[PDB]
Amino acid sequence: HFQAVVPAPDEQEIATLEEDEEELFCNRAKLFRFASENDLPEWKERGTGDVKLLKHKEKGAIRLLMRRDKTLKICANHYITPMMELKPNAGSDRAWVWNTHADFADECPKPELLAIRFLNAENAQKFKTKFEECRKEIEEREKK
Amino acid sequence: EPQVQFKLVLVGDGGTGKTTFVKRHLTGEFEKKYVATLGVEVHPLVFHTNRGPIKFNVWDTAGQEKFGGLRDGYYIQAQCAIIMFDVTSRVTYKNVPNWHRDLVRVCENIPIVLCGNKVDIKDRKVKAKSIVFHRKKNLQYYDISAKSNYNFEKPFLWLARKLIGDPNLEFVAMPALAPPEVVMDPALAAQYEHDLEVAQTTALPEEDAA
Amino acid sequence: MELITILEKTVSPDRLELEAAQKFLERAAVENLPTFLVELSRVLANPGNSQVARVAAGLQIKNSLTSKDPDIKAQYQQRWLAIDANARREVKNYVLHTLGTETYRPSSASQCVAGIACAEIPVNQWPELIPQLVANVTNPNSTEHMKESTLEAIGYICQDIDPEQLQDKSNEILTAIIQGMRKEEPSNNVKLAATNALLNSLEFTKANFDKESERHFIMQVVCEATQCPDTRVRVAALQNLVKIMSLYYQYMETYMGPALFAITIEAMKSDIDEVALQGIEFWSNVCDEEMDLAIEASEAAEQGRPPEHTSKFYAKGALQYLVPILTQTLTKQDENDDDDDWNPCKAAGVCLMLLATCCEDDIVPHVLPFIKEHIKNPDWRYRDAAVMAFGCILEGPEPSQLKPLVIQAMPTLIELMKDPSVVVRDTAAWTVGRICELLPEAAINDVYLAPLLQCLIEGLSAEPRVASNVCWAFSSLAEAAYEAADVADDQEEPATYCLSSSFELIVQKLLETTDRPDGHQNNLRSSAYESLMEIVKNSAKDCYPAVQKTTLVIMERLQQVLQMESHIQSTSDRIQFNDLQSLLCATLQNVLRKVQHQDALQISDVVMASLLRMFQSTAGSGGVQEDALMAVSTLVEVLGGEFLKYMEAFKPFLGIGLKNYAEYQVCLAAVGLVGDLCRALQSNIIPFCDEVMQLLLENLGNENVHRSVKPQILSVFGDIALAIGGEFKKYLEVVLNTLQQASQAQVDKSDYDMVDYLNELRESCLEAYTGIVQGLKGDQENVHPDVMLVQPRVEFILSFIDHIAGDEDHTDGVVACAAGLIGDLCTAFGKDVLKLVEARPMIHELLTEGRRSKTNKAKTLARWATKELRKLKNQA
Numbered sequence A: 001h002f003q004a005v006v007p008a009p010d011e012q013e014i015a016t017l018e019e020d021e022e023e024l025f026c027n028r029a030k031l032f033r034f035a036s037e038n039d040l041p042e043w044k045e046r047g048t049g050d051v052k053l054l055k056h057k058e059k060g061a062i063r064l065l066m067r068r069d070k071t072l073k074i075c076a077n078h079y080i081t082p083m084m085e086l087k088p089n090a091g092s093d094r095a096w097v098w099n100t101h102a103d104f105a106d107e108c109p110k111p112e113l114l115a116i117r118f119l120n121a122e123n124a125q126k127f128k129t130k131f132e133e134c135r136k137e138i139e140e141r142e143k144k
Numbered sequence B: 001e002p003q004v005q006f007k008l009v010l011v012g013d014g015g016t017g018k019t020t021f022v023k024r025h026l027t028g029e030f031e032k033k034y035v036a037t038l039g040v041e042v043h044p045l046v047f048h049t050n051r052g053p054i055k056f057n058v059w060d061t062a063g064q065e066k067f068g069g070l071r072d073g074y075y076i077q078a079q080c081a082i083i084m085f086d087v088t089s090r091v092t093y094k095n096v097p098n099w100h101r102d103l104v105r106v107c108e109n110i111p112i113v114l115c116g117n118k119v120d121i122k123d124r125k126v127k128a129k130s131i132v133f134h135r136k137k138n139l140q141y142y143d144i145s146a147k148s149n150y151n152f153e154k155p156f157l158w159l160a161r162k163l164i165g166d167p168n169l170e171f172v173a174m175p176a177l178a179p180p181e182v183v184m185d186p187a188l189a190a191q192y193e194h195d196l197e198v199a200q201t202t203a204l205p206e207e208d209a210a
Numbered sequence C: 001m002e003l004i005t006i007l008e009k010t011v012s013p014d015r016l017e018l019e020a021a022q023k024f025l026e027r028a029a030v031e032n033l034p035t036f037l038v039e040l041s042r043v044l045a046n047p048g049n050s051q052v053a054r055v056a057a058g059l060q061i062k063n064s065l066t067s068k069d070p071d072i073k074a075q076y077q078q079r080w081l082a083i084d085a086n087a088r089r090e091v092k093n094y095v096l097h098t099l100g101t102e103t104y105r106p107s108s109a110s111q112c113v114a115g116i117a118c119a120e121i122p123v124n125q126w127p128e129l130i131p132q133l134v135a136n137v138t139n140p141n142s143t144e145h146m147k148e149s150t151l152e153a154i155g156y157i158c159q160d161i162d163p164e165q166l167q168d169k170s171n172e173i174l175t176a177i178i179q180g181m182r183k184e185e186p187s188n189n190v191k192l193a194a195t196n197a198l199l200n201s202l203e204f205t206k207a208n209f210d211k212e213s214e215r216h217f218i219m220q221v222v223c224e225a226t227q228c229p230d231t232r233v234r235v236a237a238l239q240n241l242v243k244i245m246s247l248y249y250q251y252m253e254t255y256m257g258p259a260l261f262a263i264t265i266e267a268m269k270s271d272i273d274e275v276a277l278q279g280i281e282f283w284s285n286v287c288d289e290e291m292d293l294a295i296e297a298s299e300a301a302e303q304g305r306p307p308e309h310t311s312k313f314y315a316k317g318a319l320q321y322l323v324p325i326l327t328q329t330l331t332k333q334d335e336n337d338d339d340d341d342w343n344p345c346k347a348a349g350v351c352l353m354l355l356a357t358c359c360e361d362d363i364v365p366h367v368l369p370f371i372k373e374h375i376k377n378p379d380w381r382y383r384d385a386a387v388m389a390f391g392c393i394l395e396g397p398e399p400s401q402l403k404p405l406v407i408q409a410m411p412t413l414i415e416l417m418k419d420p421s422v423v424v425r426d427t428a429a430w431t432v433g434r435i436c437e438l439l440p441e442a443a444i445n446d447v448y449l450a451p452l453l454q455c456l457i458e459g460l461s462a463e464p465r466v467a468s469n470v471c472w473a474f475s476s477l478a479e480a481a482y483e484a485a486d487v488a489d490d491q492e493e494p495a496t497y498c499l500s501s502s503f504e505l506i507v508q509k510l511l512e513t514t515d516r517p518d519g520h521q522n523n524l525r526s527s528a529y530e531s532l533m534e535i536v537k538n539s540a541k542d543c544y545p546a547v548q549k550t551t552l553v554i555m556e557r558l559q560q561v562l563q564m565e566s567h568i569q570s571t572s573d574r575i576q577f578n579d580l581q582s583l584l585c586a587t588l589q590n591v592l593r594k595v596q597h598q599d600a601l602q603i604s605d606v607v608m609a610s611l612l613r614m615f616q617s618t619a620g621s622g623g624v625q626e627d628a629l630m631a632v633s634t635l636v637e638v639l640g641g642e643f644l645k646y647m648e649a650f651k652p653f654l655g656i657g658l659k660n661y662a663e664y665q666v667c668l669a670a671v672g673l674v675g676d677l678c679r680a681l682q683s684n685i686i687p688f689c690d691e692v693m694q695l696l697l698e699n700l701g702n703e704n705v706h707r708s709v710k711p712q713i714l715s716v717f718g719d720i721a722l723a724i725g726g727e728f729k730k731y732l733e734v735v736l737n738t739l740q741q742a743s744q745a746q747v748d749k750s751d752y753d754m755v756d757y758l759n760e761l762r763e764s765c766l767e768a769y770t771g772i773v774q775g776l777k778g779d780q781e782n783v784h785p786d787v788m789l790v791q792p793r794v795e796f797i798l799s800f801i802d803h804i805a806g807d808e809d810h811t812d813g814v815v816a817c818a819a820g821l822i823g824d825l826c827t828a829f830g831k832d833v834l835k836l837v838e839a840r841p842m843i844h845e846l847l848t849e850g851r852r853s854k855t856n857k858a859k860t861l862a863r864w865a866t867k868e869l870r871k872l873k874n875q876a
């Protein structure tokens, strides 16, 4: 039908807040979240889209910033810490499992058990290599 | 500016697929369990466009006769509507005129989107050539499926274009705030280690479209 | 009381407040209905209350009186009619005096009026209602809201009530509606309400439309409201015209010429989108009605009677003026527009396709000049419209009339495939796909085949939307080339065909298309696989090396491809026509069953290795394993060229795959797999026969799990006993057959939806008995101890199938085969078969119903049993 009315606002300025940060990586992936609150264990989906490894310009903090396709809503947003180590899943060469203590996808910190999956083993290996490089860099920074 | 709110009423028959569409849009997940809703559930959704944020208050109602609660008492001061029907059952489509009639008798001149869910099931019973209600009533029709995320954002985009008025409107990327840095007690760390072990033991569900 | 606060809490988004209000209202309704209704009506009628409270009260009253369930509605009506007369009178008086006092456009008191009227009018309990509404409408001093509310109430009453209740007062209703709908009304809101009320009450006025003096007035008022300077009234009147055409097609011949034609044509040219949409919908609906009438006339001609209704062919007479307007509206586009948006441009294409399918060859000359003129226009909109119209007119006209046109226009389409506009390229790809699908004999020969193939191969690297249609075109083109007369030879396979020169490049490019970083969009990747399976299925005996290489590289992906088997759902690539369903389904089965040529056991090795690797990577359980299991059956099937001697890989994994008993469909499919696999080689099933027997017996004896598994498991028991058996004696079948015949057939041997299981189980049991006897007969003399010759079998069978004597349910066909096999085995077994003759004669009855289906499958086996009995008597 039609309801074109006054609440139509201006154009403003669109800022994704991904500025001041260098994109070290970008790949298409699928995310899963481990449902540990509904008594029995279960794995829930979380999104599908482009996962990036953004490095801050001067603070040198690497973060994971996956977004959803066609809606552009964040389904993962957390830093990377030295303890975070990617583990292989149960008999899968293209999936990794890890754990975080403060995920900000819903703008409220929640501990999460995440599992990311890629299209093939090459992309998974590239992501794991870059993740290890970022973790080692963070560890070296915090050591000094 | 309360980030421009609107009231959306989601109506349809029993199976259809409401509360799965809304749940997929809320957290992102597919519910395989059918638990009929009692009365209504109100869920807020937010989208970002080139004009700013737009907020819907989805009133997911109950399509069961015995669980209706306040049947039409929910469609009051509503500003947009979605009528959902399942394409694998013709009865869900035969009742679209009745839902439209109940909507129009309480609300005047509001945007209404007709959605046909469960497209991915195959062996579809409501062929695309038999869907003519939108032609008769000048409605916007979409083929969606909450399982495959096919066209699953189109109804909200169309309603957003119609409600403020901008036939060229797009979903811009949601701003990404800086996540906080906190620490946890070592006992909770060991508990998380055990949970990580039991999770890594578990096997991910088998899907596609990565 | 504070009923007002409870009503005003029904719009709160909070869950607790909504639940509290609902509970309060339900409790109040249960405690005392009459006082509750009186209080609600008192709340509604007070102008001092807010809009929320008044609408909520009206909705409560309405919901107390009607429901979507017919039975609950009848119960509510009877409940209302049983209330005390004084309370009902107070409620009706309070409700009827609210009309005209609500200052908001959709009224709530009208719904209450309609709900009460639909209950009281059939028993004449409210005889002063209709005169009051008519007086309200026709009074010159009635305000705007009074007329609007009364018109809404009249429309609701005529829409909801039974059509045969107000037949004696329909004329006053029509007069009031027309009075509100006339031209001199000061307010457009009243005109809109009157038009909507007439729209609601078009089925109710069926008796009035049979009188000319009333039909003329209705049509005049509608055709005069179509000219209102208000858009909403115009759209409502056009909707009225569409519905009138739907309902009263037979009476429109008088008004089609002088009145309707000009109005609809001028509507289709309007700048306003709603008006243009309704104008186009008018003629789309006309096409629908005339297609229905054509179907009816064809059915009547086949039957041999004159049609009950005869069409008048309005679209065939309006084509000359319809086509240019549609083709002009096809140019109303934009650079950044959505394909599925339902604007006039979208509707014009649907209408044009409808006109093509409805008029056949009469639309080609009316659309050719536009195509031939604007196919090279400097403005991309007109080129896009030209190719779109060319694609739309492709379905319905004779192919022989379209072949010269497509042959002439092929070079321009190939050129437009590289158009500098995205929209033009997309539409051109769609049109080329439609040409390849609908017109096979056109785009395979001869002078433009090579540039067409080159442009298709180049476009396989285009945007996914274009590439999906390119894959569709490739699949349809290969199908056409294999089907065409270009395929020579009588060896059931062509030596060569038109695509032999470019076969390798085509399959290589498709394989490269599969590995694209964006293959998820428009299910492009999926489409590629489908195309990659058609071309290898439709090939010639000079590109076999490419076929084998492609099959080898495909079968390594079997796990992913099976995971994508259900992930097609059409809706892209292969549009319209869809056969055999699903990505793999039988398509993978058929390509795997056809690709087998020149032994090529490497394909079998790869597929079985992939299957076992997937099974091992499952690591227990696995719902998707079903898709694998049937595939294994499809690779045994009738594939004895290289698959009657499997015996190498799935033998140790048979029980492991069968181990998943939690699933039921998987269980029955695995039972069928065992049934078709036992009769393959009968060598390595011996080690697993006892294991599967005991395991499935344990599963069936407790889970129950009886309707589905039991017939199939007993049938495969017989099937395995056909060749392998002897150490299981006969107790296993005896106990189950005794239980089933004593319990499942002697209780409720009746009905229609239950006899199927019974007769199928009986047939399976008789087949299993014959198989057991034949396998234990040793096939030479007896080769068995023969202790179970007639004592446990002949005695039991006469008391086992005797339950059919109770009702003699229609078991057509295979029961004759069962009788024949029973007779043959009993005759060839021993001497005590005579006791079966001493039993009940229901077998004769079992023959009679069996003889219902002619004499091919009925009398042949009965005659075989009879002649076996005669031979036994001669031996006797």
Ligand SMILES: Nc1nc2c(ncn2[C@@H]2O[C@H](COP(=O)(O)OP(=O)(O)OP(=O)(O)O)[C@@H](O)[C@H]2O)c(=O)[nH]1
Pocket (backbone or CB within 6 Å): B012, B013, B014, B015, B016, B017, B018, B019, B020, B031, B032, B033, B034, B035, B036, B037, B061, B062, B063, B064, B117, B118, B119, B120, B121, B145, B146, B147, B148
């Ligand atoms: N295969 C498939 N199933 C779906 C899809 N969407 C929903 N379903 C199934 O349909 C069921 C819908 O149940 P609900 O979520 O309660 O839908 P509902 O219409 O709100 O049901 P009521 O509120 O009781 O009327 C779900 O349990 C799913 O199993 C779909 O896209 N594909």
Ligand SMILES: [Mg+2]
Pocket (backbone or CB within 6 Å): B018, B019, B035, B036, B037, B061, B062
């Ligand atoms: Mg629900």
